[PDB]
Amino acid sequence: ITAKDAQARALREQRRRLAKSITFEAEIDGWTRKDGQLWMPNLLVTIDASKYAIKTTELLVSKVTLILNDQDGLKTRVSLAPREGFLVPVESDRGGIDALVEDYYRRHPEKTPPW
Amino acid sequence: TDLAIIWTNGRGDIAQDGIDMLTDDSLTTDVTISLFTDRRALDSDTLPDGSDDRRGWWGDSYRDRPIGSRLWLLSREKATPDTLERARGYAEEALEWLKTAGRVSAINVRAEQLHQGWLYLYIALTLPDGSVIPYEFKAAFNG
Amino acid sequence: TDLAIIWTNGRGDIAQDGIDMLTDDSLTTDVTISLFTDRRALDSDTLPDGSDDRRGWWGDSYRDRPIGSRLWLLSREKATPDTLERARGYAEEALEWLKTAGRVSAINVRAEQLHQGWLYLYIALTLPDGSVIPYEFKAAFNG
Amino acid sequence: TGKGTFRNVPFLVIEEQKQAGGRRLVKREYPLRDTGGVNDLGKKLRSRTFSACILNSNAETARDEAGALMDALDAPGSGELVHPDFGTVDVMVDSWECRTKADELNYYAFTVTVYPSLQDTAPDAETDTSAAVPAQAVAVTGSLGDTLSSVWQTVKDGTAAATAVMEAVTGVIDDISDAVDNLGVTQTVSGLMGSLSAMKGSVTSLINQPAMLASSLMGALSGVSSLCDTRTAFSTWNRLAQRFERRHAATATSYNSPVAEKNIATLNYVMLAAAQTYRAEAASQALTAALDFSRRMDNAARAPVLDAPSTTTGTASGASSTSATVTQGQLQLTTPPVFESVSDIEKTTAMLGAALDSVILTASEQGFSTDSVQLTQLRLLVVADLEKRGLQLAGSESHHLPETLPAMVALYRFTGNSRNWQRLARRNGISNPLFVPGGVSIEVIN
């Protein structure tokens, strides 16, 4: 272990604890999404559960289970966790020319980096 | 403030007024569109024609709600109370989407047979306290 | 497009038409095969013969469905209402597979005794709109 | 007379007779929302039931008939229930009763409830015709290679026979190398090109080894097959077969030997057969690719919204691969212009069938029996796959049009969901979807 590696794991541990602490669970009616595709993990959804006095705004899906029981019908139990728990230690949730270029190519991932 | 539909010779169309088309921001255009455009007939309905095509709109699968009314099923009817009851029900079903929202408070529609060969529909809404004054016109004939 | 079954002298054989055998792609062949081919009698049913042999087809265990009808159980019967009902039931159960599929919409069959010594069945099938116009003929006698 | 029977045991109907059954519903009620509803789930069994009575004037025949009814209701299997109200049905009994009263000497009352004898499997196995083409193609290629190895005869001379065999082998190698070179504009083909060059540079010691020669050629063809993806495989194999065919018709003084005429003829034939089998497999894969791409999972009556990302299909920027479900076409690639429309699939299927039938008829005289017996089944499987997946699609109808309508309106009139309006135009073969021809027949999918 070096110093930079140390901070990397220490942050990884902090973010994993953050992800494991706060948990949302919901039971929606349709297997398919709003657009039409199936429900799958690694999706950033906007939560608007304000009627139950809940102040979270964006979450990331962590687990999707699809069910076809007779008593259930079509259901998919979708679990949500904060996005800041599944990030790499380099990135952050929203000192030179190299830093500026890296920031630009990090904000725009579909672009090809210089490498 | 969309275009207004003006009835001439028993059919409706937009009209000019001075520079450009005349405008309307009221319930008149909404009612005259929701009542007099044919929506898709059900699978089990018997069409008045001898054909088997159900009139609708290609945008019915793009606009979250069927467009118009099923009053076109009564193109050729005789003078019996069943047709009056069906027309009352069809108008209620066509215009209930307004009462579902907050744009009207209540709807009262009755069907009658006036001077022989007339299917009279009397539809009375109840606009709320804040609704704008609706447009006012009568059907007209020429030539 | 399969070979057409033509009824001559009370039995239906295939026939010629110009160069090759006459063809037919409609519900006529399906009906005349599903109605007039003997399927296996059940274990409890009694047989018109004094024999214990139940008819059928060797390939009945290969085609996911029994082939024909049980109208051969009425080979020898007297003029009584029982036979009229049993024939109606057998024809309905033989033709039900069409309605289980989507090829026919409804099947109304009635039975009657015509001129003394005649078992008469009237079978009415309601073909859907997409169904091709079926073949029609009359059984003929020669020699 | 009410003479219903269960197993040819007569009974008299009485009291009540009933049939009950409906759909299974799941009630969906949301918290803090008013508009709810139910969702459909199949249909439950029709539970029939009836009440019957047996009586006589003898008090002993009544007992005998009642016992017969007991032993016929309580029997293993399914029996022909005949009822004046139900009809003639096949049912399995569930429960029954036999009530008397010790004051009524002749009366015996039964009450039966029956269930339809519907016996159908859950998985409902079918046949996978898409995966039956490569399995048969492998066997066909193996049989062709074995036939070539067996029928090849070594020539030991240095004369016209040997040099002509050398020319034939080097010509076949030249054709394969030309196909690989035409491929290699985009794909990297250095290894296969080098192997082909070395193999061509070593002919003299191949024409004398039959088994090595056959493999040396089957391996080259297999490498060519493995090079191509689902985009250019059909085009490349089309070309190699046209070329190998222009050959087998120039064959069908010099040499003065028969062990040359036979070697050259069998080589040319085997090349033709292998090329056509690879073409058939490539066509089978191209059908899957085209059908996969011509699939839109929208099929819903929604309202368009102002969605900024991905204005046209695609995926949202930054989304991982775990979020997206892969399809069969992408899973096998690891489309042609012909496999889009309908008339084109018809023409392609006819051409493949004619070519393979000609190959079989020719093979019935050199590489006599096993090759033909395998190739006929390969042709059956290929044509069955093509027709069952391209044309014989679920819910396909044919309609005429009173006037030329836009594709969206024409689709909505016939099925009622206008979102798949591109599929109709593509399958018909229309250039501009706004003008769908009127008098010409139109295939509408449902």
Per residue, what are the HEC states of chain D? CCCCECCCCECEEEEEEEEECCCEEEEECCCCCCCCEEEEECCCCCEEEEEEEECCCCCCHHHHHHHHHHHHHCCCCCEEEEECCCEEEEEEEEECCEECCCCCCCCEEEEEEEEECCCCCCCCCCCCCCCHHHHHHHHHHHHHHHHHHHHCCCCCCCCHHHHHHHHHHHHHHHHHHHHHHHHCCCCCCHHHHHHHHHHHHCCCCCCCCHHHHHHHHHHHHHHHHHHCCCCCHHHHHHHHHHHHHHHHCCCCCCCCCHHHHHHHHHHHHHHHHHHHHHHHHHHHHHHHHHHHHCCCCCCCCCCCCCCCCCCCCCCCCCCCCCCCCCCHHHHHHCCCCCCCCCHHHHHHHHHHHHHHHHHHHHHCCCCCCHHHHHHHHHHHHHHHHHHHHHHCCCCEEEECCCCCCCHHHHHHHHCCCHHHHHHHHHHHCCCCCCCCCCCCCEEEEC
Render the burial of B56-71: b for 16+ CB within 10 Å, e for the rest.
bbbebbeeeebbbbbb
Q: Does A40 touch chain D (CB under 8 A)?
A: yes
The pair of structure tokens assigned to D407 is 């594709």
Shortest CA gap C42–chain D (Å) = 8
Q: Helix, strand or coil for residue C67?
A: coil
Type of residue found at D231: R
Residues 6+ apart with CB under 8 A from D84: D2, D4, D13
Please answer whether residues B50 and B19 qualify as being in contact, where contact means their C-beta atoms are separated by less than 8 angstroms.
no
Please answer whether residues A31 and A74 qualify as being in contact, where contact means their C-beta atoms are separated by less than 8 angstroms.
yes
Shortest CA gap A17–chain D (Å) = 22
Smallest Cβ–Cβ distance between D303 and the set B53, B56, B64 belongs to B64
Tell which phi-psi region holds residue D8, choosing left (phi > 0), alpha (psi between -120 and 50) or beta: left
- All residues of chain A having their beta carbon less than 8 Å from the beta carbon of residue D313 are none
E strand or H helix that includes residue C6: strand C5-8
Residue in D397, D413, D421, D422 to test binding to B, most B beta-carbons within 10 Å: D413
Shortest CA gap B102–chain D (Å) = 15
What dihedral do alpha carbons D198, D201, D207, D211 form, nearest 10°?
Answer: 0
Residue in C43, C44, C71 to test binding to D, most D beta-carbons within 10 Å: C44
Q: Helix, strand or coil for residue B77?
A: coil
- All residues of chain A having their beta carbon less than 8 Å from the beta carbon of residue D323 are 40-43
Cα(C99)–Cα(D376) distance, rounded to whole angstroms?
37
Give D78's Cβ-side CA count (13 Å radius).
11
Cα(C20)–Cα(C44) distance, rounded to whole angstroms?
45
The pair of structure tokens assigned to D178 is 């030309």
Resolution (in Å) of the shown entry?
3.3
For chain B, which chains pass the contact test of at least 3 CB pairs under 8 Å?
D
Give D144's Cβ-side CA count (13 Å radius).
29
**Does the distance separating the beta carbons of D406 and B64 come in below 8 Å?**
no
E strand or H helix that includes residue A44: strand A44-46
Render the burial of D122-144: b for 16+ CB within 10 Å, e for the rest.
eeeeeeebbebbeebbeebbebb
Cα(D347)–Cα(B80) distance, rounded to whole angstroms?
59
Shortest CA gap D399–chain B (Å) = 12
Residues 6+ apart with CB under 8 A from D26: A72, A73, D38, D39, D41
**Does the distance separating the beta carbons of C89 and D8 come in below 8 Å?**
no
Shortest CA gap D301–chain C (Å) = 26
What dihedral do alpha carbons B57, B63, B69, B72 form, nearest 10°?
Answer: 10
Q: How far is CA A82 from CA A102, B128, D52, D187, in A?
A: 25, 45, 68, 44
Please name the residue that has the structure tokens 């008299």: D12
| Beta bridge pairs of residue D48 | D19, D114
Q: Among candidates D146, D168, D442, D140, which has minimal Cα distance to D277?
A: D140
Smallest Cβ–Cβ distance between B61 and the set D406, D413, D417 belongs to D417
Q: How far is CA D264 from CA D151, D161, D215, D250, D370, in A?
A: 11, 10, 16, 11, 20
Residue in A28, A37, A66 to test binding to D, most D beta-carbons within 10 Å: A37
- All residues of chain D having their beta carbon less than 8 Å from the beta carbon of residue B40 are 416
Cα(D5)–Cα(C42) distance, rounded to whole angstroms?
14
The pair of structure tokens assigned to A92 is 């952050």
Please name the residue that has the structure tokens 């948990």: A23
Residue in C25, C39, C40, C42 to test binding to D, most D beta-carbons within 10 Å: C42
Method by which this entry was solved? cryo-EM
Q: How far is CA D22 from CA C101, D19, D39, D127, D288, in A?
A: 20, 10, 13, 33, 40
Cα(D145)–Cα(D277) distance, rounded to whole angstroms?
13
DSSP secondary structure letter of residue C26: S
Smallest Cβ–Cβ distance between C44 and the set D7, D88, D397 belongs to D7
- All residues of chain D having their beta carbon less than 8 Å from the beta carbon of residue C46 are 8
Shortest CA gap D312–chain A (Å) = 13
**Does the distance separating the beta carbons of D39 and A73 come in below 8 Å?**
yes
Please name the residue that has the structure tokens 């009809």: D87
Cα(D179)–Cα(D239) distance, rounded to whole angstroms?
8
Shortest CA gap C41–chain D (Å) = 11
Cα(D348)–Cα(A91) distance, rounded to whole angstroms?
53
Helix then strand then coil, in percent of chain B rounded to 5, is 25, 25, 50
- All residues of chain D having their beta carbon less than 8 Å from the beta carbon of residue B56 are 412-413, 416
Q: Helix, strand or coil for residue B118?
A: strand
Smallest Cβ–Cβ distance between C89 and the set D7, D88, D397 belongs to D88
Which residue numbers of D have CB closer than 8 Å to A's CBs? 24, 26, 28, 32, 39, 41, 297-300, 302, 317-320, 322-325
State residue B65 phi and psi, 5-degree precision: -160, 140
Q: Helix, strand or coil for residue C56?
A: coil
Q: C and D: touch, per 3+ CB pairs < 8 A?
A: yes
Please answer whether residues D379 and D353 qualify as being in contact, where contact means their C-beta atoms are separated by less than 8 angstroms.
yes
Q: Among candidates C55, C43, C90, C56, which has minimal Cα distance to C71?
A: C90
**Does the distance separating the beta carbons of A32 and D297 come in below 8 Å?**
yes
Q: C and A: touch, per 3+ CB pairs < 8 A?
A: no
Cα(D172)–Cα(D207) distance, rounded to whole angstroms?
13
Cα(D410)–Cα(D423) distance, rounded to whole angstroms?
12
Cα Rg of chain D, angstroms: 35
Residue in B51, B61, B97, B99 to test binding to D, most D beta-carbons within 10 Å: B61
Cα(B100)–Cα(D400) distance, rounded to whole angstroms?
41
Please answer whether residues D372 and D359 qualify as being in contact, where contact means their C-beta atoms are separated by less than 8 angstroms.
no
Cα(C86)–Cα(C67) distance, rounded to whole angstroms?
19
The pair of structure tokens assigned to A63 is 């687990």
Cα(C123)–Cα(C134) distance, rounded to whole angstroms?
15
Stated length of chain B: 143
Q: Helix, strand or coil for residue B78?
A: coil
Smallest Cβ–Cβ distance between A73 and the set D26, D300, D324 belongs to D26
Q: Contacts by B57-63 with C-beta closer than 8 Å and gap 24+?
A: B57/D412, B58/D406, B58/D408, B58/D409, B58/D411, B58/D412, B58/D418, B59/D418, B60/D301, B60/D412, B60/D418, B61/D301, B61/D412, B61/D416, B61/D417, B61/D418, B61/D419, B62/D301, B62/D302, B62/D303, B62/D304, B62/D418, B62/D419, B63/D303
Please name the residue that has the structure tokens 């050199």: D366
Render the burial of D72-82: b for 16+ CB within 10 Å, e for the rest.
bbeeeebbbbb
Type of residue found at D215: S
Cα(C91)–Cα(C35) distance, rounded to whole angstroms?
7
Q: Helix, strand or coil for residue C141?
A: coil
- All residues of chain B having their beta carbon less than 8 Å from the beta carbon of residue D303 are 62-64
**Does the distance separating the beta carbons of D297 and A109 come in below 8 Å?**
no
| Beta bridge pairs of residue D10 | D5
Q: Helix, strand or coil for residue C38?
A: strand
Q: What angle do CA B85, B88, B90 make, to 5 degrees?
A: 110
Render the burial of C61-95: b for 16+ CB within 10 Å, e for the rest.
eeeeebbbbbbbbeeeeeeeeebbebbbbbbbbbb
Residues 6+ apart with CB under 8 A from B107: B92, B95, B96, B98, B99, B123, B124, B125, B126
Smallest Cβ–Cβ distance between C93 and the set D7, D8, D88 belongs to D88
E strand or H helix that includes residue C82: helix C81-100
Q: Among candidates B18, B24, B20, which has minimal Cα distance to B6?
A: B24
Q: Does A32 touch chain D (CB under 8 A)?
A: yes
Please answer whether residues A35 and A10 qualify as being in contact, where contact means their C-beta atoms are separated by less than 8 angstroms.
no
Smallest Cβ–Cβ distance between D418 and the set B53, B58, B64 belongs to B58
Cα(D79)–Cα(D69) distance, rounded to whole angstroms?
13
The pair of structure tokens assigned to D118 is 């519907």
Please answer whether residues C17 and C38 qualify as being in contact, where contact means their C-beta atoms are separated by less than 8 angstroms.
no
Q: How far is CA C4 from CA B37, B72, C130, in A?
A: 50, 45, 21
Which residue numbers of D have CB closer than 8 Å to B's CBs? 301-304, 406, 408-409, 411-413, 416-419
**Does the distance separating the beta carbons of C44 and D79 come in below 8 Å?**
yes
Please answer whether residues D173 and D243 qualify as being in contact, where contact means their C-beta atoms are separated by less than 8 angstroms.
no
Cα(D4)–Cα(D81) distance, rounded to whole angstroms?
8
Residues 6+ apart with CB under 8 A from B41: B47, B54, B55, B70, B73
Q: Does A46 touch chain D (CB under 8 A)?
A: no
Shortest CA gap B124–chain D (Å) = 26
Stated length of chain D: 446
The pair of structure tokens assigned to C58 is 């060797």
Please answer whether residues D164 and D264 qualify as being in contact, where contact means their C-beta atoms are separated by less than 8 angstroms.
yes
DSSP secondary structure letter of residue C74: G
Smallest Cβ–Cβ distance between D412 and the set B56, B63, B64 belongs to B56
Q: Does B102 touch chain D (CB under 8 A)?
A: no
The pair of structure tokens assigned to D44 is 């439950």
Residue in D3, D78, D80, D396 to test binding to C, most C beta-carbons within 10 Å: D80
Give A5's Cβ-side CA count (13 Å radius).
2
